[PDB]
Amino acid sequence: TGWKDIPPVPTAQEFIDIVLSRTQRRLPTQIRPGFKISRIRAFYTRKVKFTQETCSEKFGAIISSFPVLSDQHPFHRDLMNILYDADHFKVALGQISTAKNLIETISRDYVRLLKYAQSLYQCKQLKRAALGRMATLIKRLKDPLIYLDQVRQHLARLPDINPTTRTLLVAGFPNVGKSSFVRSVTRADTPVEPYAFTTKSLFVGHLDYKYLRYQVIDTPGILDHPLEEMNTIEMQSVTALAHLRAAVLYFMDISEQCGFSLKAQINLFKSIKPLFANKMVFIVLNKMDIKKFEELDPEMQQEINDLTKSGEVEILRASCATQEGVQEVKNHVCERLLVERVSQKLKAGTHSNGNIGTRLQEVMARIHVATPMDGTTRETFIPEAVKNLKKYDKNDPNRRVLARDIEEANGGAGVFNVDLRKDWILENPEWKYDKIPEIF
Amino acid sequence: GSLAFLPRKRAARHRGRVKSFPKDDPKKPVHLTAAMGYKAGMTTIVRDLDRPGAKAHKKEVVEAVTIIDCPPMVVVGLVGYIETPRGLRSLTTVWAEHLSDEVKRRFYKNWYKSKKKAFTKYAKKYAENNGASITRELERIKKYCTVVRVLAHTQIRKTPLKQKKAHLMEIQINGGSVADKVEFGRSLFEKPVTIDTIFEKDEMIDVIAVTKGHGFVGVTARWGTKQWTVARAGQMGYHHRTSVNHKIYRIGKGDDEANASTETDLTKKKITPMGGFVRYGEVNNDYVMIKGSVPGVKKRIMTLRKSLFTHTSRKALEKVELKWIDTSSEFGHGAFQTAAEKKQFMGTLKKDLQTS
Amino acid sequence: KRGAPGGKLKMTLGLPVGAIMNCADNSGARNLYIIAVKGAGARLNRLPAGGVGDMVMATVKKGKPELRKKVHPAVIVRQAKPWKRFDGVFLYFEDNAGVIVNPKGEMKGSAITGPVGKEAAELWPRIASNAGVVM
Amino acid sequence: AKSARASRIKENHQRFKKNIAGPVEAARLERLSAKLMAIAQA
Amino acid sequence: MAVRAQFENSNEVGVFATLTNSYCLVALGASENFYSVFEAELQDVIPICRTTIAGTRIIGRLTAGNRKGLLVPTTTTDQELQHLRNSLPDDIRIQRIEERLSALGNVIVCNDHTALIHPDLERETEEIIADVLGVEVFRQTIADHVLVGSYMALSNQGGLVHPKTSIQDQDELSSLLGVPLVAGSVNRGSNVIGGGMVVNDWLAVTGLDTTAPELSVIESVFRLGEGAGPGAINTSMKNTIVESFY
Amino acid sequence: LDKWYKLAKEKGYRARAAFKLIQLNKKYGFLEKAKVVLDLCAAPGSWCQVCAETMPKDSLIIGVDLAPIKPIPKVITFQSDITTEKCRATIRSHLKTWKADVVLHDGAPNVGTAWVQDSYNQAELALHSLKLATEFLIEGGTFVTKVFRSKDYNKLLWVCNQLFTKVEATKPPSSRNVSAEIFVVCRGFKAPKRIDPRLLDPRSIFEDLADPAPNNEARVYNPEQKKRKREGYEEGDYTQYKETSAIEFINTTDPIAILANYNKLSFEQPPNGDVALAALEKLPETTKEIRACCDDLKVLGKKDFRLLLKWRLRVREIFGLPS
Amino acid sequence: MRIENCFFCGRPAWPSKGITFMRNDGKAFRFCRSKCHKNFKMKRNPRKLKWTKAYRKNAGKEMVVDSTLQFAARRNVPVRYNRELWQKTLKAMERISEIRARRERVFYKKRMA
Amino acid sequence: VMAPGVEVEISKAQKDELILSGNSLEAVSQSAADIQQICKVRNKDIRKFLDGIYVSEKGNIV
RNA sequence: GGAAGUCGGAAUCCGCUAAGGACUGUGUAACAACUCACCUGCCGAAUGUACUAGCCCUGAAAAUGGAUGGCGCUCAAGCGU
RNA sequence: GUCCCUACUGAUGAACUCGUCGCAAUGGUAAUUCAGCUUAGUACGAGAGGAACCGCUGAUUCAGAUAAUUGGUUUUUGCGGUUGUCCGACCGGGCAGUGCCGCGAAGCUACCAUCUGCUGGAUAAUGGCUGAACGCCUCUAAGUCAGAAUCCAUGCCAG
């Protein structure tokens, strides 16, 4: 559902100030040398204990808010491994846990020391030593606390990707038109500017098709590296292409305004093909306004048709600056994703057991249409007024009365007094607004 | 308890004073600001509510209302006041001729054996030279005073009380120059003023009286528990209270003979309950129907005055429509509103057949 | 959003904390034991009390073991305490009964045995649609 | 919540007094002064 | 034509409204956002009435009727009965019945030609229903639910039935009724169809949080004047139904 | 303070639960001759310690417990829970083929939720302990369970009586007498061919019994009384209404039962048509008072119910029924 | 509004007068006073108490059959509002009520003959 | 309400502009500052909600 | 991946000079653009850095209402001679 | 093995001839929190979700009253029933420290019932205008605008 509910984590100096002001202001501070030594010990035992549970509640809040990578869907696990260097993430969280236990150990030791103290002065120095030792332990946490604040703000600004839902993945080279297709279909704000790496991260959009919700993921864009060495940016698109279940839309630019050769674009598609070993792959031939399919070299037609000769790969055409091809490439892909997911859902339930599943029975109860056996339709009463009636539109300047606008002119929700006699139908119109007798 | 009502002592006077009249501006029309009446009792009504935003909107609500009997006050005087660094000072009181014996009973503690000589020489200065002493004292009010008040008294013979001593009270005139309100006060002498003219229907008013006395009680009931702040025993009740924002639901005439009749129930009946108000009697005059509870016991004089400020609620701008008014017996579980429909329901009785 | 009722007029509270009231739905529970009243304040030594149309935290004492495993919200639908409505009618029911609901105001059961108080049906539309008798 | 003596609560009440409740009370005072003028002049 | 609406922040349209082929009943309260969304769909074609029944807001669960009659329980006062009589034309028969099951909208389902009643309704109520509504009366349960009005919605063109109704129960109910019947949900998976949506022969008003697939089956079962959905769309857009409600 | 807990803190053990187990062992000796011990809820350093002393040392001591207690040395202690099937298979892999000779369970739920939620959660955990005990026990084995006094304890006593041979409610010394902390022991495991599913099911065990006959004599012979219905309503029977013909009231053998339970005696003609109904209407008896009482049975008193019973005896004298 | 009649004794129950008891089967009982309600809860029969109107009808102390008592009834089919009908209805009940009283008086003289 | 001596006119020269002019710099600048302080967003994000009325040019009429 | 003084690591030179850092900040995806250091022109004669000494403010306070003894005192009715 | 003065809460009161109407120094002081409708499925948002000002209506706590209605209370010993005993029986009554039971007005009561709770000025944190110190600059120095449930008052209690 997101990770924006993580409370902010302060630096080392603010953590000391928060903890120490909390002890000063929420507990009494006046003690006297003339009091009993048991009262003197109890005053300083309370100060040391209070500082400990204040520290333990903020340390526990940081640990129990950041995501555990083990209890995660494995798309998100390599994403935050790429984004945050997951080895450093568990080291920084380990240093919070170690400092939490060391503060508890100091409080346990110095409460015992306060038990055997004899004077107010000795109780005062033991309180100060425990508080200063806790303060030096937080001061050593300065580097982990800066790191944990940067990841939290990045995690709060991370898009919500549902890996199990219907998904359209747009991948390809830089400057082919990956981001312009997303804005054309979804109303997601993805930067479109003509330089190499504009899309720095993963952008998500949503569309509606056949009264169903879909996801469109915009990726940064990958180069022709052999995947052993890549960018942090490029690998983020790689783990999106591998650990999600989508319909990959590979974008190729026939015209050479992308800054890369057609031979390089074909070769990347062949190299990253094993990442798409399960899902369907569609090739979208983009920027058709510049160069069409037919003025290309017939040798280059043979290779991309041999790409089509591979089993599940299909080649479609579009133009993201005229919008005359981007509409049906949305309809074609989303329809093919609709059929496969239904067929997978029907198979899970019609498995080889001889019995139809329980959860496939309910949908078949839902989809079934019950009709009368006689076939005689019941006769329908619809007046002739509505068959010529005009649809109400709020932007039309010639609308009807629409009593909510009577309310707005005459007051509001709590001021306007409705009249009920105006809808009364009587033999004489003067007989409304009458005081009808009731008791005689 | 509240520390605002801290001197929990008995009220200094039975009538109870206004203590604050509304702030006056000269641009308003001339009007009086307070009145007096006598508490009769309470009844039950049904009001057709018009409260937009309420769950009882355009529905029937049953509410408790209080009846205050209001015979017409008679104006007998005029008192002028001047501004001072020490406060406000009374400069001149001008009475009228032909003062009634009722208000004359007020200036005596033993009326039955006195010679009744009050205001006898004051009746002679109205015809001494031509009335020079009277006109001089009014011109002193016109040219020196900053606000003027009216002395008015109620009549006890119109009310069913064994008392005969009238209640005399000062009522402030607001809205005009000091010259204009003086010519009101002299013209209003010897004249009855009805509650139809002072107040109006659908108006929050301010009710001032002395509460029910309970004598010496302990801290269980005086404070409400399980120096001044320490709960100590003493007098509970007979305290002066000023209540705020009570709606006038009806102003009966007393002549109309269909006071409890509404536009929806066509029964010609009056406000007096069937058998009479318990421990009060019959209301034969103008009456004011006040929504809700109101301080003071039955038979006690009630002081009504105008609200000090302009209201900030839609409850004050609400037109009140009554469906029916209860007139059944206060003396028991009365199921009959008028005498006529009790004999219609019961049928012929033995005493009715023997008499006829 | 808490399950405090919105726009309910003042009426005489009849069921305090620690009262056994009947379960009127067909979820399987037989009685409900009130342990907390939703929306009711607590100043000092005052037992919170509920009326018709007030959801409370209840525990099933007798009934189906599955429903006995957890604490449940429950809206009171009947009350033997005589209370007053704005139409002047003082009224009371034969017993105290309620129905188990979720925090959103939707009841687990499908039908309500006996009548439903008018204030409970007017405030909770799901109880109003499963009420056979509304009075 | 807001106090009864809050500055913005007072400013809302002053807008109610001037614009809504003002002309209502001025109209009812014209009728009542007219009836008092009738009695005093008679 | 099916539109979404809300009486308040509540999505239960059928609880607060009653829609027939000649009149519409709307609960009276606060603003007229609920009223205007009905007026914007009925441009003074059939009369509309702001009504209270028994001093409560839940009008759709206490009354039941078709274009020939209107029925109200015994708790309605004479003022609400007269307000209903003056508002509606004389072609509507208004009757107040002394049935102990006072929630008539929960226990009676009716269209112009048939009626489903509660099994333990009285004989004097059943004969009055046939007389006033002018329809034939049957006693049935909708998937072992005796409050038929809450869990089943019906017009002369089709009906929407509780989702967990068995296929065998759908065939015998549709044959007895003469209209196509499809099980489905309203208001994001709620089983209370009658309390969630109101339907007549040419339009339907449902809750706001009903889903896009759920609004498609309301368009399909209840036909339109445009003739887009005749009820056979379900076997054509089965793929949407399969993925959405699996 | 507790004298047995103070004895443990001085010299004895970690807690007073070990004193509870030696009291059960003193009451009945089973730890002396057994070989395999399995504790479904290991008490911290107390129950495993007395298991280490009396039994042969280091002989299949399974210490599964959901609470992360300190691991007792020479006792195979697991910090995982017991209800999951994966933990059951983990138990299976650790015992190889040696099933447990004695099974022990400590029922310690979150007590405090009005003593009814806590009693069921204790009873549900006790039935879950019985499921694993019935899965793994030798013919003639011993089972030790902690239970709370309730109506579920009566059902738990019955299911141990049906499945085992020797049943004993211990209630020993060193036990908390303030609460309902009661030990039970089951011996004589019958070794059935198949474990019955609905016998171990918590729904069938904790299903409420059939309701007894309501005091119809109290509702008829003195209906001005009290004891209002604090329990709920029966399955079905909604709308709270019941009516039959007056002939079925006459023809029945229990006139008190029909009068108390039912709302109205009807004189409406059945569609087939009863000549007994038409004869009963046309009698010189049942005039006015009987017809008024038959319309509203729920508002009647002693004299009205008595007059109905004398009326049906007179019609049976007319009609010829034996009594 | 409507003047209700007491279930126990039949005197007119006006608004805010008495109490109303609702039973689990759907039936409401309106009472005019506490005396009527308390006698109902202890399950006494109003046909036997001599102050109730059920006894008087059962014992023949007021007559039930005649044309004027048939003319008043509870109406469940509303009529359209008509000012001429409502004014002429009011003159009818003035005539109806005085005809009843002059027939009530003859009925009482016949019993006392 | 403006100070006595400052006149406010709607600019029929550019979009969404008012002119506060007068003889007293104290009166003109204070009345301009009153408009800014009365249109100020509360309990929102300053970096995103940029709505308001702001002083653009200060100078002389002549 | 991109890194042009300004995400980083290390060096930090020369010319033209009146002077201008292989750059002090703003800014760009990188540039661009602005700005600082430094320099020249105009106005004008005294400035400005660090300390020291007095007087004054802060340099920590709980809990019935109260104390330069009180009123009160400000080119003193306070401080130094 | 160490019923009295005063304080407080109430009530009277001599002298000013008795009263009637008043003024107000001084002392006290009071309201509090939540929800719902509209704004609005709006601004904002990829989605999931999701406000606020103005306006309207209720509720919790506190405070001050009140008894039309509902419930409770019964020495109304008001009416009726009934146990023991007695006045010879009937009628009418007595005793059982008010025998018992039912209803029971009036009165007292109950957030177990109902009603009512009000507006000006000056400030603190802070945001500004003009403008020196200091030829830039500056909310402060002289001058000055706004702003908290705060402060002082009015409303309210005593006199």
Ligand SMILES: Nc1nc2c(ncn2[C@@H]2O[C@H](COP(=O)(O)OP(=O)(O)OP(=O)(O)O)[C@@H](O)[C@H]2O)c(=O)[nH]1
């Ligand atoms: N003529 C033409 N130009 C296009 C078309 N689509 C995109 N472009 C241009 O080509 C550039 C493609 O860059 P983007 O739109 O950002 O797509 P991208 O492949 O994700 O590029 P990056 O975001 O930088 O990775 C854009 O700047 C457009 O100006 C097209 O359909 N026709």
Ligand SMILES: [Zn+2]
């Ligand atoms: Zn009665």
